[PDB]
Design a protein around this ligand. Structure first.
Ligand SMILES: CNc1ncnc2c1ncn2[C@@H]1O[C@H](CO)[C@@H](O)[C@H]1O
Length: 165
């Protein structure tokens, strides 16, 4: 069903993540971690303290799809297992040095063709697929986008809920 999912998303904040490659999203799905550039890292840390849930919605560039969504379980932390990210041209490992822990809510894909009716007020009412890495998605648009994803029957939101309050 969708009731625990709606509960997790209630009063959540949503951010679009644009990965330049599939490799890093696969790593994030396997290891439960994400890193972003310093400008976005600061925004996510602020959001983590402000809301009951912060949701990252992932899209690999040129894939025409979202690859899933996850909830931040921590602020960014440096000084751990150095993650073997595939680095785009012009990006350091120190730039991706902040590592957020994430709990996946849905690891299934959603094609952009299925979200064409959703626009994001925080990005000039452009279709929600459009946005730079880190673009915040307004609550109602983000909730509806997350609810469009196919259910992921492999995930039990019980332990995710157990970390909220
Ligand atoms: C692990 N983290 C990441 N992996 C791959 N691409 C990323 C990324 N974080 C940001 N990017 C993208 O890299 C671009 C800059 O080269 C940004 O505009 C994002 O779209």
């Amino acid at each position: 069903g969708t009731s625990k999912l709606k509960y997790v998303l209630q009063d959540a904040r949503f951010f679009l993540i644009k990965s330049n490659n599939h490799e890093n999203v696969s790593l994030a799905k396997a290891k439960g971690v994400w890193s972003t550039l310093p400008v976005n890292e600061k925004k996510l840390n602020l959001a983590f303290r402000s809301a009951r849930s912060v949701i990252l919605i992932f899209s690999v560039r040129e894939s025409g799809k979202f690859q899933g969504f996850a909830r931040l379980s921590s602020e960014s932390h440096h000084g751990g297992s150095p993650i073997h990210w595939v680095l785009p041209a012009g990006m350091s490992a120190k730039a991706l040095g902040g590592v957020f822990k994430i709990d996946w809510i849905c690891r299934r894909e959603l094609p952009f063709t299925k979200s064409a009716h959703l626009t994001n007020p925080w990005n000039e009412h452009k279709p929600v697929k459009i946005g730079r890495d880190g673009q915040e998605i307004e609550l109602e648009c983000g909730t509806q986008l997350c609810l469009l994803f196919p259910p992921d029957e492999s995930i039990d939101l019980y332990q995710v809920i157990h970390k909220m309050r």
